[PDB]
Every structure is written in C-alpha cells, then in structure tokens.
Design a protein around this ligand. Structure first.
Ligand SMILES: CC(=O)Nc1ccc(Nc2ccc(S(C)(=O)=O)cc2[N+](=O)[O-])cc1
Ligand SMILES: CC(=O)Nc1ccc(Nc2ccc(S(C)(=O)=O)cc2[N+](=O)[O-])cc1
Lengths: 446, 446
C-alpha cells in the first residue's frame, strides 16, 4: 500500500516536530538550491525531451524562477515566521495581540506538464518554508521530468517529509482519498472541481490555479511595433503552452492587418523563416494535444503558418484573422501556437466581450492612455492584469499569482506562498489579574 | 422557483454596477445601522422567544458587535478599497505595482441559530462593504429571528441586492444549486462538507466556520478564583450554545475539586441558587437538542446541577468530574450547559490530549507562567487562542476569526471580512516605450 505508506510516513515525520525550527527548513531549501545546481544538465535534458526546450530557455524561462524564490524565502523566513503584533484598542492596552503563523501539516502539490519543474517545485518551496511535510504528484505527460524528480528529490531532501508519488489519473484519484491539510493543484478547470470535491471530504483547503482564455486588448493610438513584439514573445514561447499566454487579441478592425504584419516581423526575428529549424522554438507535449490544436485551425482564415508535423509534434506559429467568437478556436483554452484576432469596435465592446465569458487567469491590454487602462481594469475581473506587457506579472515576488472564478481560487508566490501554506492564528494574551473594569460583563445585569 | 428569481435578480443588480461606488455601500451600511436602532425591541423579542435572552444580553452579547463592525467598516472602507501599492524591484522602477480590490459578485451567507442575528448579519456587513450582492439564508431553528429578518431586511436595504431566503434543509439544498461567487457558512462540520461539495460544482470559494471541542487547560500555580469566574462566564452564557465556549477542562487531579468549588461560587453569583429563576440564564433552542444534551449527562459523576425541564427546555448549569475521555460527553461538541472536567498529569499530556483530536475553533489556557502559554501554543493547532480568558478573542477587529481543519477554513471580522469577500487582483502597469533591458528575453538565445 505504497501511496498510504508515503503519506503516513510524511504525517508521522511532521508530528515529530522536525520541521518546526527555521534552521531545518532553511536547510531543506538550501538542499533544493544544490539540487538545481548539481542537476542543471539533467533538468535541461528532461525539458528538452518533453517540450523541446534548449539549455538557455530551460533556465531563463523555468528553473531560474525557482532559484530566485528559494533565495528570497531563505532570506525573509525569520521575518515572516515571527509573531505579528496587531493594532490594539483602548481596552486591550495591557494585552498582547498578535498573529501566530504555524504549518498546516501535510501538504499535497499536484503539478502540471507545461512547466513541469517550476509548477511542481515553486509551490513546494513555499510549503517547505511554511514548515509542512510536502507530498508531490508530478504530471505523467511530462514523463521525463516526472521520472527524474522521483529520482533526485529524495537524494537531496528529507525522505519521509517530501515523498514523490508516481502515476496518472488512477494514482492521483487514489492519492485524493488520503487526508491532507492543504492541496495545491495546477491544471484544468474541469479537474479543479474533482480536486475540490475530494478535498471537501476531509475539509481540506485548496489552492486552484486553473485556466481560461486570457484576452489581449490592443488600443488604436498605441505603438504597435513594441506591442506586437511583446505579444508574440509571450504568445509563442513554450509553443503557446502557458497558462498566462495571451490567448487571443481584441482590436479595432482598422488596425488588424498592421498587427498581423508586425507579429510576422517579430516572429521572423525570433525563429527565422522556418520555425522548425530553430532551437528556441518548442513542440507540443503529446499526440492528443497536437490534434486538438490542429483541429482548431480548421475552417479558419490563416494569415500565417497553419501547418504542422505529426511525427515531431510541431505546429508553425499561426495567426488567424477575422475570427468568429463562436468558432472552436474561441470556445476553449488554445494552449498552442495559434493566435486568433477578434474584432471589436470600441473599448466598451471589448469590456463587454470579456465580461460575458468566464474570468481569465490574466488580462492584457496595450495602450498609451492611462485612462483606457484604468477603465478596463475597473470594469473587468481577472486573476491578474498586465498593461503593456505579458507574462512578467507572475514573476514578481510582491504580486501574488492566482485565479478567480473559473481560473481558480487562492494564490501563491513570495510571502503569499508562506501565508497560503500556513494557518494564521489570532492570539490574545491578557494578564491574569483581578481587573475591575471587566466586571460589567458578568451576570446579573442591571 | 422563487429562489431562482431572487438569485437572478441579485446577479442582474450586481451586473448593473450599482454596488461599485463606495457611497452606495456606505449607504446600505448606514441603513443597517438604522435597522438596528429602529428595530431594537423587535430584535430583543425575537431573541427572547428563541433563546430566552433578555434585553441586556441580547444587546451586549450579540447586537452591539454588529454595530461596532458597521461603524468600523464605514470608517475604514475608503482606505481598504484603495489600490494597494507594493514593493518594487530594481527592474520595475518605472512601473506601477499594486493590488486592486474588487467584489466577487453574488455572495451567499448561511446563518446559524445560536446567535441568529450576529452570525447572519456580521458576515453580511463584510460582503456589503466589499461591494457584493448578498443572499441570506437564516437558520429555521431560530424561527422567530428567521421570520423577522425576512420582514425587516427588505424594509431597509436594497431589495434586489440583498434578498432573504426562507426555509430549511430542502430549501438550503436547492439554493446550493445556484451559482454563487462566494459562500460563507456557519454550522456543523458534517454540513460543511455538503456546502463544500455543492461549491465545487461552480468552483465557488468557501468560508467555513465549523465546530469541535474547545479545550480549556488550567495550570496548577495560577489564581483559580479569577480563572473559574471567567471560564464559568464563557461556558454558561447563552446556555452553553457558543462555538467558542470552553467545552471541557483539562487540569491536574490535585486542583480538580477547588475548580469545581470556585465554579459553583461563580455560578451562584451569576444566576442565584436556582438558575431557572434568573432572567440572565438562557434555554436550549429545540426539543431535539435538549435531549441530546441530557443524554450526555448520563452515567456521569455529577458535582453540580444535572437536572432539566423538558417543557421550557431548561438545563441547570452542570459540572461533571473525573470524566472518561471515551464517554459520549467527550466525543461530541456539547453545545449546552454541561462542563466536563478531564484529568491530565502534566502540560505535555494536555498537549498530547489536544493534538490527538480534531483541531478546535478555540484553545484556552489559564496560567501565570508565560513559558507554559508559549509552549502550548507552539505545540498545538487551533483556529484561535486566548490565554487567561475566553470568548473575547473573537470580538477584536484586528484578530481574524476562523477555524482550521475540522473547525473550518478561511476567516472574517474587520479588514479580513473585506479581504475575504473581495478578489485581490495583482496589477502591473508599464510605460509603453522602448526598453533595452527587456531585449535579453527575446529569441534567438545565446
Ligand atoms: C519574465 C521573463 O522575462 N520571462 C519569463 C519566462 C518564463 C516564465 N515562466 C512561466 C510562464 C508562465 C507560467 S504559467 C503558470 O502561466 O504556466 C509559468 C512559468 N513558470 O513559472 O515557469 C516566466 C518569465
Ligand atoms: C467581549 C465580551 O465581553 N463579551 C461577549 C459576549 C458575547 C459575544 N458574542 C458571541 C460569542 C460567541 C460567538 S460564536 C461565533 O462562537 O458562536 C458569537 C458571538 N456573537 O454573536 O457575536 C462576544 C463577546
């Protein structure tokens, strides 16, 4: 009964109080740091095999953000873990009022496949920092990374506290019968409901980082040269397989073709004339997803790319024009290198378009006008927002990353990770003295 | 069917953007303030009929805390709602980084019966302040308060935005099929799982204020006169029907009888020789609960009280001695005026006793030694903690109130209510100019 054994062993190890001193956690974190350094080439190998990442983007688009998180947490831990004194009242002057931070217990992190290292290990850094045992369940789709982590994690980190669980849906389903103190899951909206249903049975709090279609509004009087380069970058990295990728563009029909053009120009700079020959361009994860993505290109007006190779699972950077909001490519998260352009004739119409759909993980807008930015923000709802750039808003330690509605609940990154994986316990400490002022509360009343 | 209409009307009213300006929210809150003043005697009448509260404790043990919350929120709203600037990095100097607060949408508050006004309206204050539509579902067990709120709420507050839903389990069950943006529920652990299961279907975030047995540890060398007075107060108010009532006592067998004695002494001061003749002493809510509470007194060593009257649903303040941890009275939340005393022979044994059970909403300890206080806190887990008092820790605006594990998830009160009923949206605003520092990210890579 291996799953149950790993969980039981993790719980027992947590109960012994081993994780409580900050020294212990900082050292596990320092062990992770060494893992990342000593296994750099193996990590690159795994990412290359799974997603056709090269050595540069394997580091600068995934791994390096784990390191920065580790470095930041090690540094801020004593301050975060310290009891937090709070505002008193005229009646609680003599009292101590503070918030006490403590671990939840055993935490489950369920990873996903598009960034199989980062989206497994970054949440773990937080949960470790917060003093929890952490059970890991990597995605099977990132087969090479899943198998590597199961090997190297126990080589560096405490064996009982941080077990890795292998498998897929059947194994995952069985893991969710075990009692956890917190569950963090990154993946799809549909599975989020399953995680939550399973969590309810033990009243387990959850953090769900889910999906949706992240809109990208482009304004008329803005510099499209800068805009389209940034959009193309965030859209086409990892072959479009990014939760906060700009999924589609909204723009006035008068600027459509210029956008198409400036995108091509930027794409050619990134990946050359043929993207299949670029070491910087990725591949689709699985055969099933390759076909899903191809099927969305059908019956569409292609302005660029449009072709794919089933063997190596390559899809050329594709731009679609005059796209029908009801067509398949606009009815699901694309998660591939296909960028539809939908026309709207005003800011107000773009806002309405966004609000009639489920709330996205990210919302993007490009504009020189501060008032256009402020209005779209005030009148929409999304997990997070970036104006005049993409992706970057989820890499800053001071901005919590998370969804809302269908794109998720809860958040992590930086201090938020510590908070998410802790219980914040309200404490009141009074002196035990006969206080004559408190005698009014006691019966009988006058 | 008319449940569906109320929700739809509430959603449409929220969609119109009516709740967004702070002016509107403050107005609704000022209307609630008016309600509490103009309906003071009707509220007292309802609480007297349901729980045998008198006019003094109806106000000072319930209603006054709604008022303080309203006054505090009105005052702090502009500050809380304001965009919150966050720490920058050397690379985001030119940028704007802030957290934007926005309503979730339509909020459901499901109330409970023991404090049928406070535990319905206090959460509502927060959800209103945060700019949501708020659907209310009062507990049917507090039949008089449930029926009153359905009458008076629409007289003072916006009719579409803040509907009251009448009924019980069947009506509640049907309400949970509707799509909400947040659900707050106060009640039992068992029903919490149902709420959460229903919430998963729409990925609705939940705040669960649940139950458990709140322990009260009494140390050997502390002044038992002050201790037992405070314990008896918190234990026996509202006839023991309090989520954060000290449920049982843990103490060394050497101080047991003194405790029993000092409790009697305090009880006699509160409610006279016969508590049935005191207008300050409450009654059990329902016939079903009266019997539940009586059945827990059986086969137990009674040291005081022990008798009850089925007609008026009165149970005398009861103290049980040398109680077996395995007996019924120690295997469920008492929620009645029956105080068991369980013997432990050390602090370490008390800690172990607490940790082997489900996590309680509150943990109480009485001691002159701060090192004993600090140790029990560090080595246990509970929703909140009070040392050398009871109840009071959940009445301070700066201490979030909520559970952990089986005692619940999430929290509210003060600023936390505002946060809980909002989405905290991370915003990054960059200038749309050229940035040569950004060039390093674009392919082709080194
Ligand atoms: C900031 C920058 O220049 N480049 C850059 C490149 C890649 C990333 N990574 C990155 C991008 C998106 C996502 S997600 C959650 O939307 O799938 C996750 C990561 N991640 O954590 O690895 C983050 C930043
Ligand atoms: C602070 C003080 O002296 N007395 C005092 C007396 C009564 C209360 N009320 C009070 C006590 C407990 C609970 S609960 C959630 O545990 O059921 C709720 C309320 N309530 O309705 O606000 C709060 C404070």
């Amino acid at each position: 009964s291996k799953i149950s054994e790993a969980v039981k062993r993790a719980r027992a190890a947590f109960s012994s109080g081993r994780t409580r001193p900050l020294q212990f956690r900082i050292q596990q974190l320092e062990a992770l740091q060494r893992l990342i350094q000593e296994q750099e080439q193996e990590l690159v190998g795994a990412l290359a095999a799974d997603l056709h990442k090269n050595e540069w983007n394997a580091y600068y688009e995934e791994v390096v953000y784990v390191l920065e998180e580790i470095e930041y947490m090690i540094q801020k831990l004593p301050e975060w873990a310290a009891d937090e004194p709070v505002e008193k009242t005229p009646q609680t002057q003599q009292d101590e009022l503070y918030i006490h931070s403590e671990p939840l217990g055993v935490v489950l992190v369920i990873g996903t496949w598009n960034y199989p290292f980062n989206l497994t290990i970054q949440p773990m850094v937080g949960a470790i920092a917060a003093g929890n045992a952490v059970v890991l369940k990597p995605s099977e789709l990132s087969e090479n990374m899943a198998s590597l982590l199961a090997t190297i994690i126990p080589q560096y980190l405490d064996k009982d506290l941080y077990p890795v669980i292998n498998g897929g849906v059947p194994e995952t389903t069985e893991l969710l019968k075990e009692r956890f103190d917190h569950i963090l899951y990154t993946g799809s909206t549909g599975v989020g409901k399953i995680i939550m249903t399973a969590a309810a049975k033990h009243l387990t709090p959850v953090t769900l980082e889910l999906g949706g279609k992240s809109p990208c509004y482009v304004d008329k009087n803005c510099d499209l040269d800068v805009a389209c380069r940034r959009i193309a970058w965030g859209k086409f990295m990892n072959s479009g397989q990014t939760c906060v990728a700009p999924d589609y563009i909204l723009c006035d029909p008068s600027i459509q073709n210029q956008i198409v053009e400036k995108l091509k120009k930027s794409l050619k700079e990134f990946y050359g004339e043929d993207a299949k020959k670029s070491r910087d361009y990725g591949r689709i994860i699985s055969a099933r997803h390759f076909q899903r993505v191809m099927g969305l290109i059908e019956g569409q007006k292609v302005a660029y790319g449009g072709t794919g190779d089933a063997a190596t699972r390559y899809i050329a950077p594709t731009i679609l024009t005059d796209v029908d909001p009801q067509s398949p490519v606009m009815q699901e998260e694309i998660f591939g290198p296909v960028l539809p352009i939908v026309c709207v004739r005003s800011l107000e119409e773009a806002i309405q378009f966004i609000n009639q759909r489920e709330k996205p993980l990210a919302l993007y807008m490009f504009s020189s006008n501060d008032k256009v930015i402020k209005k779209m923000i005030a009148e929409t709802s999304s997990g997070g927002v970036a104006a005049n750039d993409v992706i970057v808003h989820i890499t800053l330690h001071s901005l919590p990353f998370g969804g809302v509605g269908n794109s998720g609940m809860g958040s992590y990154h930086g201090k938020k990770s510590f908070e998410t994986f802790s219980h914040r316990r309200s404490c009141l400490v009074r002196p035990l003295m006969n206080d004559e002022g408190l005698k009014v509360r006691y019966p009988p009343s006058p």
